Design a protein around this ligand. Structure first.
Ligand SMILES: Cc1cccc(Cc2n[nH]c3cc(O)c(C(=O)N(C)Cc4ccccc4)cc23)c1
Length: 207
């Protein structure tokens, strides 16, 4: 298990998200679905020149899995996935420019719902989750588990769990007062309102 410090600007953004009074928390779902959709577009595009990239799975979809016992909402996709390099170094350097632009925009009168326009939409997961676990598998690498409860650090380890073939799985360990995001009617309402035009099937699992 490797422990890493977030870049200063990311730790500052994560503290703003956790501490600011903001009732419109539901925006987290649209942001994660949009990230899954981008990964699915990436695998679909690469598969045109190289069809062998779909050997780890042909089906291109998004699964929404609530679990009231574990108090978790899982977002699964069969996108391109991420390598260890994509996960750590790569998607921690790009973020700096967008993070600074977003925080400057917030001071200028913008609200938290505009987060996705700065490519840092993922961090909106901390509006509803006390801990986020990200399991990912890319064709060129092994299966990795990323995790953070904020506090300025994240961990990365080789995942010994159930193999996923290819894609990314976001496990949101929900805060005690955010269990509405485990309700079928609530999730359905959010997807219909903010993610109705996603070009991939979205399956809301029931318990
Ligand atoms: C912990 C962490 C590390 C890196 C990125 C993320 C964001 C994320 N949230 N939900 C996702 C779902 C995804 O399928 C992917 C992905 O594998 N790619 C290939 C798409 C992608 C979208 C947006 C940014 C980077 C990659 C990234 C994310 C979380």
């Amino acid at each position: 298990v490797e422990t890493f410090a977030f870049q200063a600007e990311i730790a500052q953004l994560m503290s703003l998200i956790i501490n600011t009074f903001y009732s419109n928390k539901e925006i987290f779902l649209r942001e994660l679905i949009s990230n899954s959709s981008d990964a699915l577009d990436k695998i679909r595009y690469e598969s045109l020149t190289d069809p062998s990239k779909l050997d780890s799975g042909k089906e291109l979809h998004i699964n929404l899995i609530p679990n009231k016992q574990d108090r978790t909402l899982t977002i699964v996709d069969t996108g391109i996935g991420m390598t260890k390099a994509d996960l750590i170094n790569n998607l921690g350097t790009i973020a700096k420019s967008g993070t600074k632009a977003f925080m400057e925009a917030l001071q200028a009168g913008a609200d938290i719902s505009m987060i996705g326009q700065f490519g840092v939409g993922f961090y909106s997961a901390y509006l509803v989750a006390e801990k986020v676990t990200v399991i990912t598998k890319h064709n060129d690498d092994e299966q990795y588990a990323w995790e953070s409860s904020a506090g300025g650090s994240f961990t990365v380890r080789t995942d010994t769990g159930e193999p996923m073939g290819r894609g990314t799985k976001v496990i949101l360990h929900l805060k005690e007062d955010q269990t509405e995001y485990l309700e079928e009617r609530r999730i359905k309402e959010i997807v219909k309102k903010h993610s109705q035009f996603i070009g991939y099937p979205i399956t809301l699992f029931v318990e």
